Design a protein around this ligand. Structure first.
Ligand code: HEM
Length: 465
């Protein structure tokens, strides 16, 4: 390929980054922010300023990688450093996380990265026999509540009940603990939401006027002191509930305190936060796919479960071709976590589709994942939600281009990489979610809005089997 100069610029000091931030949040929105510049520069690789800049991030300057050929450099731990960039060009105060740099912020070259990631692998494996029954019990109660609410109101707010369900499910599956039996009671979703906001506010908009938002959430960090007491309630829950897991932390040579802050983070931030975005998005996209698709899913799911003597098992799920494909298509079409960063460790030559580009050691690389996973040079019908996309031998080959987990779907998270520790768990619970819906309902209708993190979604009809 021809070597091209990386197009784009960072504009004026102070003023450049602020105007780019306004485009990003207000005047364009993330997707059009990136696409308008792809068009202008005639390039899927270019220089751009990223939020938050201001007083929160020291340096907003990045090289953006916006196609599925260039983007995977962000996975290569010999090319990029992945230290302290889980949230991008700033890092939330460690006062938010017990004074520890949590696993998500650690480069694989750090010894505690290996230890802590092994801890989470153990958490997931040891939970294996609890996931099915706890999912089916907690989500059954959720759909019961949504039916109740639909009968009362003519619509049922999915997110408003599902956030509690997801936390209860995780507490029961991971720690064999019902939060209703503890001091947390039903307060966890509110506590976690505030704490996550204190971490992520510089990257988020709530729809308030920019005159209010800019000074209040985009310029300076919210003080961690204001969420410390909330965080302490969560910590005491994890400390008291995670006994069996803490035994393994002891064996791995991790302090009880460090282990507990890490379990809190993986459970509340990575898992529950991830599910908070993913599940409503799934309900939205599957809802939009239409009743013929719903009927095909119901037919497949019910037939397979019947073939399996009414027992839902991992092997039965493997028979559910359309179900597996629809889950992968949700993750392709709308990756729940869209921003991945990496700092070049050495001089690199990054190949796009039609040119190569040279980046210097120390440059911050950034990828907006939906542009890599909806890349029309990789996927046909790239901007269409295609339920059956991954069905069959040929469809399955395309999984190497599904990147939700911060690596190819065909690859395995390891202590040597920064791929999502919960990769297999997420795909499993997403499948269980679709299964639970269509074993109960023939089809459904939705009403939808936006949310700081993804979508808000109401059911307006739930057609029982
Ligand atoms: C739908 C839910 C989830 C989504 C969308 C998601 C997505 C991601 C993404 C995109 C990253 C890469 C972060 C980066 O370096 O930019 C990541 C990392 C990580 N995730 Fe997940 N995740 C989810 C669930 C989980 C679960 C269930 C676990 C349970 C252990 C988990 C644990 C982690 C950990 C520990 C890392 C850092 C890995 C490392 O340091 O090597 N996540 N996740």
């Amino acid at each position: 390929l021809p070597i091209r100069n990386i197009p784009g610029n960072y504009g004026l000091p102070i003023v450049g980054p602020i105007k780019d931030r306004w485009d990003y949040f207000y005047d364009q929105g993330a997707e059009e922010f990136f696409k308008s510049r792809i068009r202008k520069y005639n390039s899927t690789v270019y220089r751009v300023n990223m939020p938050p800049g201001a007083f929160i991030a020291e340096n907003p300057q990045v090289v953006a990688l916006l196609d599925g050929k260039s983007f995977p450099v962000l996975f290569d731990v010999d090319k990029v450093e992945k230290k302290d960039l889980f949230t991008g060009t700033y890092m939330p105060s460690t006062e938010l996380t017990g004074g520890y740099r949590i696993l998500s912020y650690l480069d694989p070259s750090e010894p505690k990265h290996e230890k802590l990631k092994n801890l989470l692998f153990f958490l997931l494996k040891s939970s294996r026999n609890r996931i099915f029954p706890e999912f089916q019990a907690t989500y059954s109660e959720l759909f019961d509540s949504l039916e109740k609410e639909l009968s009362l109101k003519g619509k049922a707010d999915f997110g408003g009940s599902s956030d509690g369900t997801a936390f209860n499910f995780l507490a029961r599956a991971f720690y064999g603990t019902n939060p209703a039996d503890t001091k947390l009671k039903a307060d966890a979703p509110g506590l976690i939401t505030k704490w996550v906001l204190f971490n992520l506010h510089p990257l988020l908009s709530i729809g308030l006027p920019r005159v209010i938002e800019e000074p209040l959430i985009h310029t300076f960090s919210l003080p961690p002191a204001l969420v410390k007491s909330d965080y302490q309630r969560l910590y005491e829950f994890f400390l008291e509930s995670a006994g069996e897991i803490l035994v393994e932390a002891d064996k791995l040579g991790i302090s009880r305190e460090e282990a507990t802050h890490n379990l809190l983070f993986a459970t509340c931030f990575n898992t529950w936060g991830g599910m908070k975005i993913l599940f409503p998005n799934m309900v939205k996209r599957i809802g939009r796919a239409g009743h013929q698709v719903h009927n095909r899913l119901a037919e497949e799911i019910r037939s397979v479960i019947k073939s399996n003597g009414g027992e839902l098992t991992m092997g039965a799920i493997e028979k559910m071709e359309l179900t597996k494909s629809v889950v992968y298509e949700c993750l392709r079409f709308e990756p729940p976590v869209t921003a991945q960063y990496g700092r070049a460790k050495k001089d690199l030559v990054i190949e796009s589709h039609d040119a190569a580009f040279k980046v210097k050691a120390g440059e911050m690389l950034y990828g907006y994942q939906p542009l890599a996973t909806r890349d029309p040079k990789i996927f046909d019908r790239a901007d269409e939600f295609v339920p059956e996309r991954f069905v069959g031998e040929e469809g399955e080959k395309l999984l190497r281009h599904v990147l939700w987990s911060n690596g190819p779907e065909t690859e395995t998270p390891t202590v040597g990489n920064k791929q999502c520790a919960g990769k297999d768990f997420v795909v499993l619970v997403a499948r269980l979610f679709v299964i639970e819906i269509f074993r109960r309902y023939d089809s459904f209708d939705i009403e939808v809005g936006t949310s700081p993190l993804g979508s808000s979604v109401n059911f307006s009809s739930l057609r029982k089997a």
